[PDB]
Design a protein around this ligand. Structure first.
Ligand SMILES: O=C(O)c1ccccc1O
Lengths: 230, 6, 230, 5
């Protein structure tokens, strides 16, 4: 009943668009040590996506301003220091999520579905760290992202159907990682195309409860392919 | 930008 | 920090949609004691509008949930305690703004334009307090809002042109106050209609620097009239 | 509906 109250409070915070409150509720649920249900897993994922998402969006705006103010030394230095402040928040949020994944989520995942979901999530949060990392630190971070995505990729190919939304969502983010982080448009296109074509060949495997999610991800995979081959 | 998001 | 530096940081925070940072910068500027420029005044106004705005929006969502929970006592209690937590934040923000207006902004306003601006702002933040107040203290809060708006209304009619965005914006919010706080649809309609008709009769007084703001407010005044007379 | 920034 206590865990159920924290989950109800998280759902209230979601509706009120108070994502710091939502993330704090779901972090406390996770820290209780019990394996999360599909609903709890999704509430934790939505909460942190919005929390980290606000920083990634702010980072992109401030970086664009920093580039556009070349020539104006005072304006550019200010944009640089504000970008550094946003990066610190971003790193603190990513480290919070990655710590939850290492200590509770990945070790307790008893199903292929949840294990793939958390390893993809580990891949995503190291990728967000990689977007604002530099030097030696970056090489290690990028490596960690690739290793998490690779293990999730192998499990999904072995245990899930090609139309499974989690398998598809992983192929979408792993292809984004190759394009944006590793600067490999051909590997990114090959991954995305294979995932799309294998799902298209087995549309009979779609379920009524998840066909919308599956078809939406397939559309996103093909949108990326169109963009990357233009 | 087109990721899952997640 | 330096005044011009704090203002530049506030403009960066605005673009990054980091309104807590924006408000903290502008609060520090105000506390330096010097009269704010038109730009500084607007940055302070935008910052706090967004800070308080997020709480007003969350309050409406949570109150609606609490009301639709009529029948489930424990679940209703959770939404009620969450609404109260949001109200506390909302009151703290309003009290912050109202304190800045009384101590620095209203006493140092050296022009009719800035005096009207700050008194309208005082009217607005007491109106936001009135939206979440009950019974006995509500009456005093409602009176403070009406008095601020009334003094701003008299100065604007005497010193500003009917198309002035500040005069129009004040008529828009004062009419909202009559409709939503005093439950007087006819006085709200009369105030809004007079403001719209007087601006329509003098469209030759529009300036290139502020015709966009003036015409947008005129559209909002007429939208309210249409809604309140339907 | 009040003032728009
Ligand atoms: O449609 C309006 O409300 C309006 C407002 C300003 C000027 C001309 C207009 O038609």
């Amino acid at each position: 009943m206590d865990k159920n109250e924290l989950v109800q409070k998280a759902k209230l915070a979601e509706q009120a668009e108070r994502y710091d409150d939502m993330a704090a509720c779901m972090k406390s649920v996770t820290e209780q040590g019990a394996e999360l249900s599909n609903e709890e897993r999704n509430l934790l994922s939505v909460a942190y996506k919005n929390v980290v998402g606000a920083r990634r969006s702010s980072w992109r705006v401030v970086s664009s301003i920093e580039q556009k103010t070349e020539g104006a030394e005072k304006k550019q230095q200010m944009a640089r220091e504000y970008r550094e402040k946003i990066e610190t928040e971003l790193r603190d949020i990513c480290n919070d999520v990655l710590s939850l994944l290492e200590k509770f989520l990945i070790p307790n995942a008893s199903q292929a579905e949840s294990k793939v979901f958390y390893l993809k999530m580990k891949g995503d949060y190291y990728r967000y760290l990689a977007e604002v990392a530099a030097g030696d630190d970056k090489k290690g971070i990028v490596d960690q992202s690739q290793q998490a995505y690779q293990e999730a990729f192998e499990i999904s190919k072995k245990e899930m159907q090609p139309t499974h939304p989690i398998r598809l969502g992983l192929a979408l983010n792993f292809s984004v990682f190759y394009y944006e982080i590793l600067n490999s448009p051909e590997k990114a296109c090959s991954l995305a195309k294979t995932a799309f074509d294998e799902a298209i060949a087995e549309l009979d495997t779609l379920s009524e409860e998840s066909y919308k999610d599956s078809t939406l991800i397939m559309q996103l995979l093909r949108d990326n392919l169109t963009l990357w081959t233009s | 930008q087109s990721s899952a998001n997640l």
